[PDB]
Amino acid sequence: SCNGLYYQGSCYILHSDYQMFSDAAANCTAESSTLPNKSDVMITWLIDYVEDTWGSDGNPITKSDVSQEVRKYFCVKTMN
């Protein structure tokens, strides 16, 4: 029932509109979700999916002034 990536109790849903960080974060909040935490994803099979999408720290997730940058993003919600 996770139409996206399921990892250790969390469902990662891809949003494909390129958005500025603040807009992306506002979308996940409205969805009662969070952006991915770069530390939670870097050592996992999720990294190739979430690379270069918004991390919860305000930067595109990797392996400068970014306030005008636009990226896709995942909204993350725990499944119970």
């Binding site: 949003h15 494909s16 509109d17 390129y18 958005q19 500025m20 807009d23 636009v70």
Partner: peptide, 8 residues
């Protein structure tokens, strides 16, 4: 304007 309507 992107698919979901996001517009810059």
């Amino acid at each position: 304007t992107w698919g979901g309507g996001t517009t810059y």
